[PDB]
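Materials and Methods. Structural model of Segment polarity protein dishevelled homolog DVL-1. The 82-residue sequence of Segment polarity protein dishevelled homolog DVL-1 from Mus musculus was retrieved and submitted for structure prediction as follows.
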Amino acid sequence: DTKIIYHMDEEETPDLVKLPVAPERVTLADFKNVLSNRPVHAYKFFFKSMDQDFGVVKEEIFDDNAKLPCFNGRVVSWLVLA
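The predicted structure was written out as tokens:
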């Protein structure tokens, strides 16, 4: 029910995936499990979100059970190595 586009440092273009789960209740784990071909543990994972005080920001999220920020119905992410 929910589509996250994500960016890689070493890719000309962003990827776009859809997860079964709903826009809420969708969590870092969901996203991670859809990336079986990638070495997930080596990455950091930032998500575009709206902070009520500073506006648009790239929020880092590290807990598998953390809901993912949605920017206008859309989850937008950046993967980075440690």
